[PDB]
Amino acid sequence: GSAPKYIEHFSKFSPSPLSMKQFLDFGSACEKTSFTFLRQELPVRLANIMKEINLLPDRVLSTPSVQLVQSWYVQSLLDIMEFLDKDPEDHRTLSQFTDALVTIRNRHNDVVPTMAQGVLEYKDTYGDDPVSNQNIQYFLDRFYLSRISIRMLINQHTLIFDPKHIGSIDPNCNVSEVVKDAYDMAKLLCDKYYMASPDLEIQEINAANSKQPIHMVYVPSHLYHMLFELFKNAMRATVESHESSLILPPIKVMVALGEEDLSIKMSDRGGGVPLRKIERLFSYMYSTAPPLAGFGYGLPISRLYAKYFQGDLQLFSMEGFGTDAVIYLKALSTDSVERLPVY
Amino acid sequence: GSAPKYIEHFSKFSPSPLSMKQFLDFGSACEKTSFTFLRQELPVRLANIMKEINLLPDRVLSTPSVQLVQSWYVQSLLDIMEFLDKDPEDHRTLSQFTDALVTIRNRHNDVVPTMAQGVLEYKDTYGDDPVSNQNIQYFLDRFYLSRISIRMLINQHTLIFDPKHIGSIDPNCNVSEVVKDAYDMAKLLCDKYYMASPDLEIQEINAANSKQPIHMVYVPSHLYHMLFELFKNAMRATVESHESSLILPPIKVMVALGEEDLSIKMSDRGGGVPLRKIERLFSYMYSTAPPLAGFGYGLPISRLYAKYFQGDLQLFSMEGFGTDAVIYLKALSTDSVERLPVY
Ligand SMILES: Cc1cnc(Cl)nc1-c1ccc(N(Cc2ccc(CNC(=O)C(F)F)cc2)C(=O)c2ccc(O)cc2O)cc1
Ligand SMILES: Cc1cnc(Cl)nc1-c1ccc(N(Cc2ccc(CNC(=O)C(F)F)cc2)C(=O)c2ccc(O)cc2O)cc1
Ligand SMILES: CC(C)c1ccc(COc2ccc(CC(=O)NCCN)cc2Cl)cc1
Ligand SMILES: CC(C)c1ccc(COc2ccc(CC(=O)NCCN)cc2Cl)cc1
Ligand SMILES: [Mg+2]
Ligand SMILES: [Mg+2]
């Protein structure tokens, strides 16, 4: 077959980041335009990450975990190749494409738990030294980022071509709302497994406008994933740190709108982490092994979601007291451009 | 002369970090022991940083700014060479040594404003690209760290051999006190140049012991420098951000003692910094150029002081609202070991 050639060809191209502007504009008339873009762009992006996978050392490459996903990405690449010469003006060519994208979405779901298994085999088969950890961290952050960028495109298509929301984007996303729901659901799982649960104090700061509710252009699902992961972490720590005592501090959130950053601090009084152990929480390796630990996207993955549109997600803590966690986003849709790894 | 040989010889040795334990123990009887240690150790440390200076590219090496300090370090090295074969049991050999250390302390004072001039010439003579900034940052952080480690030794000696304080160390340092003084003095300069000034809310958390005042083993001068720099930064931002308005939020500090970290958050509601501009505040380059900006040690240098005994100093902010700044220290004197750059 052709995978390596197909790959080697498309990895000459550089992926094309989009802004929310461009994403929004694809959703006003335009189906066949989305198509001619994506049949080009998906192979580029697929190929680039496939090129980097195949540069991994053979002792990783050859693990069952990796070989399995290398297999998935190959099918997907090809599935989308089929369409490179099909004719855009055919109201049926466009339709078996969309089916084709969904079929590809389903293949790819179990990718997280699969890589973990590779991470795990690697830890027990070669070790957990710091130099290993840098390589794994390096490669997963890129891989997982790439993968998020592909999902973004695919959902954008399938969701539009099956007013208000434009696919997965909400041009009038109400940050407070997303916060309250992540909390209510976290609260739910907390009340179940613990039989106490912190309250929530939201506070807003709209610097420019004094007192408007804080709205933004974003992908609310991403922001929900992020907030959820954090609330879960805060609740666990708050609740267990105070089993012996009665009084249970709330989790406070502040949501601050400046001239370029829209930021979201979440503060717990859960007893905190010593500075030395904090980088650990972001490491795929030091955090994989075999109560409400089964829920949520992971801390490293939450952070990628923020980096994905030029944000970040940082933790800082005070041992003996508790932890702040902050999500940094771009206030301006203009500055919200995809972040993508290269070659 | 011999400088390059002397240098090449001593740069084979690795500097020897000390704990507060070892520092304290030098100060109970022991003068001539401090001497035989220091005549060895100072040359090692002097030599190592001198070796790294001389590995700088000739277009930096040759600037007047650098050549001047390369000259100072050489004299100092030699001044201390004189003593390598003098006889420890001579109650006068020990005495012209101490004089010799002070003489060396005075030579070295204007080193900060001198390097700035090299930084400045370099910025206008070759540029301020990011790759330059990494090199400067790299080299000054090490240089300035080294220099702090030498001063530490020298003061330790001169201060002991001219109960309670043991040189520059206070084995019962009361953190709250150091905080209040840094504030009162900052408040002073603020009241002078601005004619309003925030109040201060200290709060303590002693996790282990419920309610004891929080004491520690530290070098209070370092901690005062640090706190001062921060208070100045917070006050400026708080005061100017609210000129148009009436109400003036206080600066709050929390001082938290855990099982290994003793931490010190200082929170302002000064309007903050956007995430993108924050690394800038730590860069020697982006922060050198030609109201109460004349006071205090610098932000990068404050941070080194914290790293010096395995701590750190971090900033995180929320544009539209304000900034947290945290000093991370080791709670345990056992974990308080000098951090030193290598070869
Ligand atoms: C990483 C993670 C994954 N899943 C779950 Cl349910 N929790 C965590 C997790 C949560 C909190 C922490 N800790 C450390 C921690 C661990 C346990 C406790 C509770 N105390 C005790 O169990 C007792 F032993 F002291 C408190 C704090 C934090 O300080 C913290 C980290 C991230 C965050 O967003 C919020 C945080 O508070 C560490 C890991
Ligand atoms: C770096 C520095 C050096 N010297 C002096 Cl006096 N101040 C600063 C400095 C102080 C505050 C900031 N800003 C940014 C800043 C700048 C100006 C303002 C005031 N607002 C205005 O001037 C108005 F134009 F908006 C507010 C915040 C902060 O957010 C900040 C940084 C560090 C810190 O410890 C505490 C901080 O608050 C930046 C630089
Ligand atoms: C499970 C998956 C995500 C996984 C697991 C583990 C790894 C680890 O990859 C490593 C580990 C060490 C080195 C250093 C070295 O000696 N390099 C020379 C290379 N020949 C390079 C790489 Cl790529 C990556 C990806
Ligand atoms: C003022 C003092 C502190 C100062 C000022 C400026 C610098 C800058 O030093 C640089 C700048 C660029 C490079 C890249 C390069 O091209 N390297 C090849 C080197 N030949 C290396 C170095 Cl050491 C250091 C110290
Ligand atoms: Mg962090
Ligand atoms: Mg920082």
Numbering used by the authors:
A (entry chain A), B (entry chain A): 6 to 33, 36 to 169, 177 to 304, 314 to 366
Paper text:
PDK, a member of the GHKL ATPase/kinase superfamily, regulates the activity of the pyruvate dehydrogenase complex (PDC). The PDC represents a central control point in cellular energy metabolism in that it links glycolysis with the TCA cycle by catalysing the oxidative decarboxylation of pyruvate to acetyl-CoA in the matrix of the mitochondria. The four mammalian isoforms of PDK (PDK-1,2,3 & 4) reduce PDC activity through phosphorylation of specific serine residues in the E1α subunit (pyruvate dehydrogenase). PDK isozymes have been shown to be over-expressed in clinical cancer specimens and this augmented expression has been correlated with poor prognosis as well as drug resistance.
